[PDB]
């Protein structure tokens, strides 16, 4: 990230542009807090993100958006 | 519960005996702490 005049100064003759667009994600992550860590969130005071996954080890579409990628 | 003297004194004529044979269980219970309660006893420090 920089200011506009420095962007111009950089793209003038120092850096070499590669592309004008890029495919980027178009969605978010998501946490739910359901299942077994719900009662741990209510009865006791703790809750782990991947509870159903730590228990087992204890025994999308994108979009082509214009940008200025330099190498 | 009492002392043998008081037990004899009661059995003499005051109390009214009901039986001579009873039925006691021949087992205990059990707590195991396995599974969905084990992990919470290892990651955090509580279990139910």
Q: Is A36 on the interface with B (CB under 8 A)?
A: yes
Query: Can you list the positions of beta strands (E) in A1-71?
Result: 17-25, 62-70
Cβ–Cβ under 8 Å, residues B44 and A46: yes
Pairs of residues, one from chain A and one from chain B, whose beta carbons lie less than 8 Å apart:
22
Query: What resolution in angstrom units was achieved for this structure?
Result: 5.3
Q: Give dist(CA A23, CA A21) in Å, integer.
A: 7
Distance (Å) of CA B24 to CA A42, B17, B21, B27, B45? 40, 19, 10, 9, 37
Residue A62, chain B, CB below 8 Å: the answer is no
Q: What are phi and psi of A65, to 5 degrees?
A: -115, 140
Whole-angstrom Cα distance, residue A42 to residue B9?
57
- The whole-angstrom separation of Cα B27 and Cα B46 is 28
Question: Which are the contacts of A60, defined by CB distance < 8 A and separation ≥ 6?
Answer: A25, A26, A27
- Cα distances (angstroms) measured from residue A56 to each of A19, A30, A45, A47, A59: 44, 21, 22, 16, 6
Nearest to A36 by CA among B26, B48, B22, B31: B48
- Report how this structure was experimentally obtained: cryo-EM
CA dihedral sign of residues B6, B12, B14, B18: positive
Q: Across chain B, which distance is largest between two alpha carbons, in Å?
A: 63
- Check CB contact under 8 Å for B43 and A46: yes
A10 in Cβ contact with B10 (< 8 Å):
no
Q: Which of A43, A48, A59 sits opposite B43 (nearest CB)?
A: A48
Provide the 3-class DSSP secondary structure of residue A2: coil
Phi, psi of B11 (to 5 degrees): -65, -15
How many other CB atoms are there within 10 angstroms of residue A55's CB atom? 19
């Amino acid at each position: 990230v920089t200011t506009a005049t420095l962007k111009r100064q950089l793209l003038q003759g120092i850096l070499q542009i590669d592309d004008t667009a890029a495919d980027v994600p178009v969605t978010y992550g998501e946490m739910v807090l359901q299942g077994t860590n719900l009662v741990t969130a209510l009865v006791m005071g703790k809750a782990v993100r991947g509870m159903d996954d730590v228990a087992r080890h204890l025994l999308p579409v994108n979009a082509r958006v214009p940008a200025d990628l330099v190498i």
